[PDB]
């Protein structure tokens, strides 16, 4: 009895229509009740209830029954959501013709005009044939929520949704392979479209929301290195403002900024310290955030031996004078072998301003022998300003602050340069990014547009280990993933010269996995007992092998990156030659691929991209593919998310059959198992991994995690070559 439509015209309620829809969306699901849904939604209907409202109501109805015991409600809700969005975008369930859609969207200025110039209407007709709009039915409610909220092209003021997932994927393919010769262009478009619509390959939010639209901004994270100079400080700051203004994560290395008290100009003026500048980079970072809060993230890096280290380590400590705190940025403490030995031998660590110890800073990242030489030399030399601190004290201080805030990260710089794709002497890795997985060369700017500066970027993607059947599927998947991002590099715009410089110079990519947890469950391994070591070794060898192959194949086609000669890859060196040897004692799986054939092929034809893999975290992308995030174990079987539209629940993949197979985050007795697996993955990974360390207070006497335990785990990670360490989760129930 009485319903209102979209024009605002009444009509009587035919309740079999609704039922039909529910009936349709339930097709194939197990354990869902259409009556349950009907019952819960019919009670909230009323005379003249907008038709849209009816849709929302049954969607929520379905959405509110999501559960571990009835996980198909996810798909029932999803489909209803998909149906509604169809009507919302097209005024009907059936999506328009690809060509008709693109024309319309070009005329409305929602899509890039180049699409119509780059492809012919018959080409668009051809692409349409690749599309499979029923794939929309494979998304899980949470996923549809993500697509609707941050992927699908829409009007943010009015609310209007202008497209559908399949169109998004086809046009992302179309745009990324638009410069291909016509003999293979559409073959690639089709292959990549299938790869992404069947969730084999995940692509970052910026790419997914924008590639197809008129924008050209797609970089999610930047790495700026700051020289010790007002000009460089100013330059750095300017770069950050431009980059956070395009919503990018910032990773800043401010390690050479000389210490407080250091001479300036001679003896005419003494330095003011690093903090004042850190505060300045922090305002730069939050310059485009509501008030000075909402968004804009950064992670600043400094050597453990910096003279102001003890003041830098407590910058997030809340209990402290305002002037001696830079609380809204995460920090990455950089350690090397020598520092750890100081700890183990119960010795001292000497603190030094980088400005007063010629060659130390470079040595630290590029040459450990030379670092050690210089370090001891300057320890003796009494002319050099310095400070002694007890290694245990320093380490404990750092771990304390890491334990309390969770955000004091570690970067093992020796591991970052002895086991990397680059030549430490020519292009060392002296920092990471926001989430501690990127590891690339950087050069300080002396001005925003300085052409001799170098800024690293994150050009990412990921394989879904839950969606491949065998590891040999990664050969085609790696082809597509490498070929699309490489295209992206030429596709997008660079706001700062230095950022283009490194992009074109080295063409560095960072491809990782999502769904690791589910994959291990599928093979009956766990994280904590070492049961997954060899499988992990097997799996990451495939990933790296096929990515290097794809890049090598691409170099043949289009030429290696300009700066390929600064890579160790160029010198015939491979990941399997410089990994951390201790790894041998925790896994015996033998290399299955022909690395030596490849070694030569790389030597001969080079690599298109200087770096190819990087294991980054992933909330969104994982959500769309209903996959456990990146390489982390799930906290629980059902994940809750808040929204204006209600509570969002997502059940881990195949909970039905794998509930006992999973090993949930807090079921692991400690971090060893996991730190082993990260070490194994690092053997083959070009860049770094976002490793986490987790602690449950319940597992310790008096509920207090022992510092001994914290240092033990830190040393473990170093022992197996872990490059960086990100979050520390302390459970708290």
């Amino acid at each position: 009895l009485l319903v209102t439509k979209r024009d605002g015209s009444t009509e009587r309620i035919n309740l079999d229509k609704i039922h039909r829809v529910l009936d349709w969306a339930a097709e194939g699901l197990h354990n869902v009740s259409i009556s349950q849904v009907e019952l819960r939604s019919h009670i909230q209907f009323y005379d003249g209830i907008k038709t849209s409202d009816i849709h929302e109501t049954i969607i929520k109805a379905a959405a509110d029954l999501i559960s571990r015991d009835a996980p198909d409600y996810q798909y029932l809700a999803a489909r209803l959501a998909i149906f509604h969005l169809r009507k919302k975008a097209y005024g009907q369930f059936e999506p328009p013709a690809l060509y008709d859609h693109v024309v319309k969207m070009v005329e409305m200025g929602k899509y890039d005009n180049h699409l119509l110039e780059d492809y012919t209407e018959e080409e668009f007709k051809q692409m349409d044939t690749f599309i499979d709009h029923d794939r929309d039915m494979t998304f899980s409610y949470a996923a549809v929520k993500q697509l609707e909220g941050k992927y699908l092209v829409q009007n943010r003021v009015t609310g209007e949704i202008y497209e559908s997932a399949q169109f998004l994927y086809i046009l992302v393919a179309a745009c990324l392979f638009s410069n291909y010769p016509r003999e293979t262009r559409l073959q690639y478009v089709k292959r990549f479209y299938d790869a992404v619509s069947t969730f084999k390959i995940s692509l970052p939010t910026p790419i997914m929301s924008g590639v197809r639209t008129p924008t050209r901004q797609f970089s999610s994270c930047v790495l700026i290195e700051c020289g010790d100079s007002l000009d460089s400080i100013n330059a750095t700051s300017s770069a950050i403002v431009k980059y956070v203004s395009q919503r990018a994560g910032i990773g800043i290395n401010a390690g050479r900024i000389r210490a407080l008290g250091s001479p300036i100009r001679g003896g005419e003026a003494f330095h003011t310290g690093c903090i004042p500048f850190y505060k300045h980079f922090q305002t730069a970072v939050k310059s485009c955030s509501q008030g000075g809060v909402r968004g804009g993230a950064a992670t600043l890096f400094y050597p453990m031996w910096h003279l102001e280290v003890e003041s830098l380590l407590v910058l997030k400590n809340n209990r402290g004078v305002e002037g001696n705190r830079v609380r809204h940025m995460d920090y990455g403490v950089q350690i090397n072998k020598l520092m750890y030995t100081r700890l183990l031998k119960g010795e001292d660590i000497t603190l030094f301003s980088p400005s007063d110890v010629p060659g130390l800073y470079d040595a630290f990242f590029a040459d450990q022998e030379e670092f050690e030489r210089l370090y001891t030399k300057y320890e003796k030399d009494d002319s050099i300003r310095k400070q002694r601190v007890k290694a245990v004290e320093l380490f404990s201080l750092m771990m304390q602050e890491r334990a309390s805030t969770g955000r004091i990260y570690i970067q093992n710089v020796d591991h970052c340069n002895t086991h990397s794709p680059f030549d430490p002497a020519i292009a060392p890795v002296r920092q990471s990014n926001l989430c501690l997985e990127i590891a690339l060369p950087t050069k300080p700017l002396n001005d925003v547009n300085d052409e001799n500066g170098e800024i690293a970027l994150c050009t990412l993607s990921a394989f879904n280990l839950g969606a491949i059947n065998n590891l040999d599927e990664l050969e085609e998947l790696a082809i597509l993933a490498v070929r699309a991002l490489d295209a992206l590099l030429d596709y997008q715009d660079y706001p700062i010269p230095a950022a283009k410089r490194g992009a074109m110079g080295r063409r560095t990519l960072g491809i990782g996995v999502i769904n690791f947890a589910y994959y291990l469950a599928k093979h009956g391994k766990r994280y904590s007992d070492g049961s997954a070591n060899n499988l992990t070794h097997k799996t990451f060898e495939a990933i790296q092998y096929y990515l290097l192959k794809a890049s090598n194949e691409l170099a043949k086609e289009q030429g290696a990156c300009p700066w390929f000669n600064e890579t160790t890859y160029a010198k015939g060196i491979l990941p399997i030659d410089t990994y951390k040897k201790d790894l041998d004692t925790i896994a015996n799986e033998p290399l299955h691929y022909d690395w030596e054939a490849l070694r030569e092929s790389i030597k001969t034809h080079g690599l298109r991209n200087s770096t190819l893999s990087a294991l980054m975290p992933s909330e969104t992308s994982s959500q769309i593919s209903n996959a456990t995030n990146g390489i982390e174990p799930p906290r629980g079987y059902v994940s809750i998310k808040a929204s204006k539209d209600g509570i969002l629940r997502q059940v881990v993949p195949d909970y039905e059959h794998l509930h006992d197979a999973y090993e949930l985050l807090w079921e692991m007795p400690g971090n060893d198992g996991y730190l082993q697996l990260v070490g194994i993955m690092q053997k083959f990974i070009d860049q770094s991994i976002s490793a986490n360390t987790n602690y449950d207070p319940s597992r310790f006497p008096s509920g207090k995690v022992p510092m001994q335990q914290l240092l033990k785990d830190l040393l473990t990670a170093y022992k197996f070559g872990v490059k960086t360490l990100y979050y520390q989760n302390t459970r708290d129930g």
């Binding site: 030995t341 183990l344 119960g346 245990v392 510092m707 001994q708 240092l711 040393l715 022992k719």
Partner: peptide, 13 residues
Amino acid sequence: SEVDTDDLSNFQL
């Protein structure tokens, strides 16, 4: 916060 250096000393980096 209690840290034993002897326990850690024998560790092999």
